[PDB]
Enzyme design. Structure first.
Site, PDB file in Angstrom:
ATOM      1  N   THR A  82      -0.612  -0.364   3.141  1.00  0.00           N
ATOM      2  CA  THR A  82      -0.573  -1.195   1.923  1.00  0.00           C
ATOM      3  C   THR A  82      -1.259  -2.520   2.267  1.00  0.00           C
ATOM      4  O   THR A  82      -0.834  -3.257   3.173  1.00  0.00           O
ATOM      5  CB  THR A  82       0.888  -1.479   1.487  1.00  0.00           C
ATOM      6  OG1 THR A  82       1.493  -0.273   1.021  1.00  0.00           O
ATOM      7  CG2 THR A  82       0.919  -2.532   0.370  1.00  0.00           C
ATOM      8  N   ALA A 148      -6.353   4.900  -7.724  1.00  0.00           N
ATOM      9  CA  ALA A 148      -7.296   6.026  -7.601  1.00  0.00           C
ATOM     10  C   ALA A 148      -6.882   7.112  -8.583  1.00  0.00           C
ATOM     11  O   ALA A 148      -7.706   7.897  -9.063  1.00  0.00           O
ATOM     12  CB  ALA A 148      -7.253   6.545  -6.168  1.00  0.00           C
ATOM     13  N   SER A 149      -5.585   7.166  -8.876  1.00  0.00           N
ATOM     14  CA  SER A 149      -5.055   8.169  -9.831  1.00  0.00           C
ATOM     15  C   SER A 149      -5.694   7.906 -11.203  1.00  0.00           C
ATOM     16  O   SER A 149      -6.197   8.823 -11.865  1.00  0.00           O
ATOM     17  CB  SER A 149      -3.508   8.087  -9.891  1.00  0.00           C
ATOM     18  OG  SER A 149      -2.959   8.526  -8.633  1.00  0.00           O
ATOM     19  N   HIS A 192      -5.368  15.357  -3.569  1.00  0.00           N
ATOM     20  CA  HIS A 192      -4.137  14.672  -3.959  1.00  0.00           C
ATOM     21  C   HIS A 192      -3.578  15.164  -5.307  1.00  0.00           C
ATOM     22  O   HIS A 192      -4.328  15.609  -6.166  1.00  0.00           O
ATOM     23  CB  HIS A 192      -4.431  13.176  -4.003  1.00  0.00           C
ATOM     24  CG  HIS A 192      -3.225  12.329  -4.205  1.00  0.00           C
ATOM     25  ND1 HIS A 192      -2.980  11.662  -5.385  1.00  0.00           N
ATOM     26  CD2 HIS A 192      -2.194  12.037  -3.384  1.00  0.00           C
ATOM     27  CE1 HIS A 192      -1.856  10.976  -5.277  1.00  0.00           C
ATOM     28  NE2 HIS A 192      -1.354  11.194  -4.076  1.00  0.00           N
ATOM     29  N   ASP A 270     -13.255  11.242  -4.490  1.00  0.00           N
ATOM     30  CA  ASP A 270     -11.984  10.502  -4.256  1.00  0.00           C
ATOM     31  C   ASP A 270     -11.938  10.176  -2.774  1.00  0.00           C
ATOM     32  O   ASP A 270     -11.703  11.090  -1.967  1.00  0.00           O
ATOM     33  CB  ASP A 270     -10.769  11.379  -4.630  1.00  0.00           C
ATOM     34  CG  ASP A 270      -9.432  10.792  -4.172  1.00  0.00           C
ATOM     35  OD1 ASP A 270      -9.395   9.684  -3.589  1.00  0.00           O
ATOM     36  OD2 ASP A 270      -8.389  11.451  -4.403  1.00  0.00           O
ATOM     37  N   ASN A 299      -9.939   2.775  -2.550  1.00  0.00           N
ATOM     38  CA  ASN A 299      -8.956   1.667  -2.783  1.00  0.00           C
ATOM     39  C   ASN A 299      -9.020   0.617  -1.685  1.00  0.00           C
ATOM     40  O   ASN A 299      -8.492   0.844  -0.606  1.00  0.00           O
ATOM     41  CB  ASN A 299      -7.511   2.199  -2.805  1.00  0.00           C
ATOM     42  CG  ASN A 299      -7.211   3.113  -3.982  1.00  0.00           C
ATOM     43  OD1 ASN A 299      -7.954   3.168  -4.970  1.00  0.00           O
ATOM     44  ND2 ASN A 299      -6.098   3.842  -3.876  1.00  0.00           N
TER      45      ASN A 299
END
Lengths: 448, 448
Positions: A82, A148-149, A192, A270, A299
């Site tokens: 993170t 990213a979703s 994912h 992705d 990301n």
């Protein structure tokens, strides 16, 4: 609260944050408190009158910190990093004061223009094809999304609209429902769960393509496409994953991208986690075939030190699916300026080298084996033998409270993951983490 | 960047933020710079070596502020308020330092437990039926979502799952796919576009129910339901809007709720803006019928001083649809503590009163008419005459650069909106904004 009190409170919180992060190795990775600990510590209703900031400030260590998971501790190996950095914290203070969520349409030059330039700065850092750069003067450019979703869904919707338009043009007699019922997308079986989410929300069929050694091959993708065409379906979209969540494997974009182009499917890449590494020339080979992609996402809020949310997405034609929502470009600008390219590349390289160091320690121990090739900041490993002994090991490790690790499983092989998460990680942390794993395994053996 | 430098930078930014907000009446509501101004002001690539924070700070007034929309200026009337408060800014500094996106599932006491208590604090402030409150020991409770749009989708998805599970039992011979294709939801013709979005992403039919005086009646909803059942469709969801985006009208929840109850439709209440007013006893009658609702949502990040994102959602059974993501509870806690109930109530009341004041000034000018009943912080008005002369008026006002207003249209009636957005608004701002409207109309008149 008025400005003078705000200033005292905010500057005190600045002190608190620096104290917390600079001394984070003092924090325990297992919370001492039990679930249900919080309610007792605070009142059952909001106060009628305003309380003092000094009392809120006192409640941070008293009420909050005992129940916090310390994601930025170098002893804590979460699924992926993170991002946190000091430059991003400062930018977000300013964004907090001047941004809006974007309910009323943002017509503001600063929000929009800074986003265009930052996506060009970052696109150049990644050596993206010129077709993705706004400064090339084409249709291409980028947008900063939240996740990213979201990026995967946005690209699927764009692909859906594009295919709709193209299939209508060629068959004006077909209605939308008929065309939309035929649409099929593709992704690796290691993709994912956000791709599945996107298929569901996008209202299309999704096919899992069987991967080979965790990597999707062009021939497998092409076979899948052909079968659906033989059924009268309309392939329209494929997600190529660079850095899978389970083991950080890489689909062969250099095969799949051309397959997609040839069959007129939109190719979305992705690279949520692993894409940050593409700022380093030695890792750019991993996105060979990028010229074939219709969209590309990674990301910065995982591995490139930009506090959430910051999901950077480029498109050959951004229109098919707007800008400055939440002023996310401000933190991207602060990070890129206050780190500079060299320091960001150093950050990636240090993490890759730490994961390799840990993988070498692991394999030197004949009781263990890698569960996947080492890629990026991630080592997948297990005790030789059964899944249950590994489940046991992970439980014991996490229970000892010196480090934290997370499990994964690919086709009946359960394994442990050590991802480099904290920006405070140093090489001696790899020694510490390995020695802790090994000590845990020693203890298991000696349970008679 | 290390801690000492971070502290210098962050504390300088605190100074900057206070200076900006406390003197925000100095700012021009029309950007002076033209589109394209930003690129020439900054380099075409990221720096190789780190820059100094002082140079970034200098660039805030030089590069950013010339192109910023000043959402928090009392001269700027955007669609609805964007919440900003000093307590929320400080909370977000800390959240930035300790929270995560939730990629790795947060198994963390503080994040989760604080969210539950704050939703009970807030639910009490709204006097929500006991069934929505976690402290009542039932199945009901609350989650802090990111947006009302997401909240509406989440409820739709829960309702979808619930209906499907009901219809599978009464029709075990029917396809799951057959059932899904029959699902239909309802909302007012004045509901926000986010309901349409939820219908699209939720993969269901959506019916726009004809409103009367901008308000959806129970009978109109029932009539549309019965019509659909008559064609073998399956009603499952309706959105009842309390405070429509166009004119802040209120659907008849007292009528619509029981209609939904009777025909077994999940009733979701979208009170994104106006919901903040229900913390005041004198406005709670506007959610009469709340007992009949399955979910209820409003956004503290519009009108209740909690910086985005913060969309508060309660459900009678929150298991039909994962707490603590992004630690949004922290800012809610800080705001509720550092304002207290009384001051938040006072905030709502002042804004409602300002809107009434503006409306009085408007109607006193016989050239103008209200386009809707005044509700909450919003006045909808227009010059008597054509939509076209009103479009000219709006363009003229915005071009004059003294205030900013926004347009809306309800069934071929175009009108201007004055919503109270800024937390800095004062009584005299209403007189200023009215006098500016009137002066523009004068300036328009004195032209042929």
């Amino acid at each position: 609260m008025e400005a003078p009190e705000f200033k005292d409170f905010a500057k005190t919180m600045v002190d608190f944050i620096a104290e917390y992060l600079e001394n984070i190795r003092e924090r325990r990775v297992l919370p001492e408190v039990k679930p249900g600990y919080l309610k007792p510590l605070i009142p059952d209703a909001a106060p009628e009158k305003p309380e003092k900031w000094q009392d809120v400030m006192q409640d941070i260590e008293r009420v909050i910190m005992p129940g916090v998971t310390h994601w930025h501790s170098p002893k804590f190996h979460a699924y992926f990093p993170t991002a946190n950095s000091y430059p991003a914290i400062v930018a977000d203070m300013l964004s907090g004061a001047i941004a809006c969520i974007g309910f009323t349409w943002i017509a503001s030059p600063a929000c929009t223009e800074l986003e265009v330039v930052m996506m060009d700065w970052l696109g150049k850092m990644l050596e993206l094809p010129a077709e993705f750069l706004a400064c090339s003067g084409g249709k291409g450019g980028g947008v900063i999304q939240g996740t990213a979703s979201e990026s995967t869904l946005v690209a699927l919707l764009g692909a859906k609209a594009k295919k709709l338009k193209e299939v209508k043009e060629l068959h004006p007699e077909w209605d939308e429902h008929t065309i939309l019922g035929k649409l099929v997308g593709y992704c690796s079986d290691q993709a994912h769960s956000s791709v599945e989410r996107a298929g569901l929300l996008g209202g299309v069929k999704l096919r899992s393509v069987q991967s080979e050694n965790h990597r999707m091959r062009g021939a497998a993708l092409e076979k899948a496409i052909e079968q659906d065409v033989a059924e009268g379906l309309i392939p329209f979209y494929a997600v190529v994953t660079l850095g899978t969540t389970n083991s950080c494997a890489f689909d062969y974009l250099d095969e799949c991208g051309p397959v997609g182009n040839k069959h007129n499917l939109w190719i979305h890449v992705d690279a949520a986690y692993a894409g940050s590494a593409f700022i380093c020339p030695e890792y750019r080979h991993l996105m060979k075939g990028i010229e074939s992609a219709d969209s590309f996402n990674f990301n910065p809020h995982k591995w490139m030190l930009v506090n959430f949310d910051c999901s950077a997405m480029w498109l050959k034609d951004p229109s098919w699916v707007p800008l400055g929502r939440r002023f996310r470009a401000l933190k991207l600008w602060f990070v890129l300026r206050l780190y500079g390219v060299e320091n960001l590349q150093a950050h990636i390289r240090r993490h890759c080298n730490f994961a390799k160091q840990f993988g070498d320690l692991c394999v030197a121990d004949s009781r263990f084996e890698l569960a996947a090739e080492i890629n990026m900041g991630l080592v997948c490993f297990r005790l030789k033998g059964s899944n249950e002994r590994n489940e046991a090991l992970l439980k014991r490790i996490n229970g000892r409270g010196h480090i934290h690790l997370v499990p994964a499983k690919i086709k009946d092989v359960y394994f442990l993951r050590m991802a480099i998460c904290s920006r405070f990680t140093q090489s001696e942390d790899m020694e510490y983490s390995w020695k802790e794993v090994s000590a845990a395994a020693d203890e298991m053996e000696q349970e008679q």
